[PDB]
Design a binder for this molecule. Structure first.
Ligand code: NAD
Ligand code: NAD
Ligand code: 9L9
Ligand code: 9L9
Lengths: 286, 289
């Protein structure tokens, strides 16, 4: 059972971006700049944001992390977002989630200018994604897709089970993998089952045993065990649980054809696909 | 034997409800609602459907007009008409009947309808909001599919649903509505939903439908669904309309012997589409969203 290294794949992707950025700068353009807004003291968020600005510097993208206390109000966050939207030096702008409960996450995401929305969370980017149009794709779902494509695991006509339906992770993953290879933004042409918190465990297993690709994005440890997987299927662990994913790694290790580890799997791919999006935003292709 | 769900009967009831809501709106002293339909070319199915929409408008007390244009119209001329209608305060709802000719970009057309008048739910903002489970103008055929299920009392939470078809105006919204959270702004069905399409091998489709409590076929393939694919007691909703006579995607007579529920073609989802459009038009006229 091949253990796919997300670290190695994201290394290639980041090298590609570093090349694309250097060539872009060589032709006289402004160096790309990414602004990350971070709210409060969530230790995972700080770690994740640090991994994003480390990767940016490595690929020639300038960055600033702007840290605010959790006691910030919604109006003050909106003010900051608006100043950044109007700062021509800023090409990409993202607000790290989760935000405190007194702040409306959807209003914040919709406040980032769409051309700077390297998260792909603005409702117009969500809509364009769901219509298979050119869009800024969200980093974690695009990272899952890249994991699958660059490992050469086929999707067209194959059975895919996604565990989870969150709008930032599980749902874009299901959208990418079932949609038409031939559309503006190609999809994976797979047969996709969406399961979630109301799928009975027994019904989950009855679909996973049929799956050539099981993608777990629920945030429950050991949700995916070896009896649910069929021999040779690919299992992609998006979950992050305090650290393990959603898959029983050691057991499923012995039945799957491929598997991603946690850490070092999807995580570093999320950071890598954000670099792609940032150079895309700098070029104003979309 | 399977209960046959009359979509025409359900739709007629829904139109009575819309008629009452429109009369109350007018009696309260608001302008009577007006729906404009733009029809391009001479697709006979399109002319049929638009005639059914304008009839239903008259039944429910909504003023209407179909504006017919030759297929040789240019995209810019269609956008000029759309802009004119966007700016007419007498028009509450505006829709452009699909499909359009090849030289007209359907997405740009749909995005040019002012979102408050977008009774189709095809504007990208309505699509985005729907995919986020936010309040939105829901597209008529998927909403009609949802209402057949809800008004017949067929359960969805925790159940297995297979949708055959992934088109952006029909199959994708049906899949979105049925799998999403019951507790969100726009509630969903909380079902476990398999999305199949033109590259799903016939043997793999069957392997999923046989587990399904609800099978929703919107492919446009006669006899795509047959009795061996359906588990006994399951609900089967036939969105397809295929000229062969008009048939659905379902082997009606065969699946009728195994399903718990089934919708006919014609007289099933079709009239439900027209009824849910009338609902969206009074919604648009009220500026609720
Ligand atoms: N780069 C990465 O590796 C990366 C990036 C982002 C998020 N994640 C992780 O992905 C996971 C989920 O993402 P989120 O934060 O958007 O999740 P969330 O907390 O919003 O919800 C997770 C989803 O799992 C579903 N679910 C719950 N119980 C289930 C069950 N028994 N069977 C099937 N589905 C079930 C829920 O309905 C929900 O849709 C988390 O672990 C999150 O940290 C990983
Ligand atoms: N009110 C109504 O009943 C209503 C309204 C609109 C359209 N329709 C009908 O619904 C059908 C489809 O409409 P559309 O606009 O989505 O059509 P479309 O041609 O845009 O889409 C066809 C869809 O079917 C899928 N498909 C094709 N072969 C398949 C197969 N073997 N298995 C599974 N999926 C397969 C395709 O991949 C695609 O997703 C047609 O019969 C159309 O006339 C009905
Ligand atoms: N706005 C916004 N908010 C968000 N919360 C996200 N998700 C968002 O950052 N996910 C994420 C998860 C893990 C890692 C990561 O670096 N994972 C490493 C190690 C992390 C750790 O040490 O815990 C790994 O899994 O190998 C990076 C990003 C996002 O993409 N955008
Ligand atoms: N803009 C736009 N274009 C579109 N093409 C649609 N779909 C869109 O009109 N579907 C539809 C299908 C069938 C009927 C209908 O009246 N069906 C009847 C009989 C139809 C017939 O005479 O053939 C039935 O199914 O029983 C009405 C609408 C839409 O909703 N919006």
């Amino acid at each position: 059972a091949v253990v796919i290294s997300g670290r190695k794949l994201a290394q290639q992707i980041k090298q590609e971006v570093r090349q694309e950025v250097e060539e872009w700068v060589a032709s006289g353009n402004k160096r790309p700049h990414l602004s990350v807004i971070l709210v409060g003291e969530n230790p995972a968020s700080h770690s994740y944001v640090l991994n994003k600005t480390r990767a940016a510097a490595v690929v020639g993208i300038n960055s600033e992390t702007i840290m605010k206390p959790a006691s910030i109000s919604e109006e003050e966050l909106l003010n900051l977002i608006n100043k950044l939207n109007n700062d021509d030096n800023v090409d990409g702008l993202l607000v790290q989630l989760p935000l405190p409960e007194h702040i409306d996450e959807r209003r914040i995401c919709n406040a980032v200018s769409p051309d700077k929305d390297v998260d792909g969370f603005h409702v117009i980017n969500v809509g364009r994604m769901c219509l298979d149009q050119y869009s800024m794709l969200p980093a974690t779902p695009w990272g899952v897709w890249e994991i699958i494509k660059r490992t050469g695991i086929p999707t067209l006509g194959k059975n895919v089970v996604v565990a989870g339906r969150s709008k930032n992770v599980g749902m874009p993953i299901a959208m990418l993998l079932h949609t038409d290879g031939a559309h503006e933004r190609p999809g994976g042409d797979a047969t996709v089952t969406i399961s979630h918190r109301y799928t009975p465990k027994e019904q989950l297993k009855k679909h996973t045993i049929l799956a050539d690709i099981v993608i777990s994005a629920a945030g429950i440890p050991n949700l995916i065990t070896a009896d649910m997987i069929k021999e040779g299927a690919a299992v992609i662990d998006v979950g992050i649980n305090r650290l393990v994913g959603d898959v029983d790694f050691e057991g499923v290790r012995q039945k799957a054809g491929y598997i991603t580890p946690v850490p070092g799997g999807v995580g570093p791919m999320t950071v890598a696909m954000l670099m792609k999006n940032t150079i895309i935003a700098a070029k104003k292709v979309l």
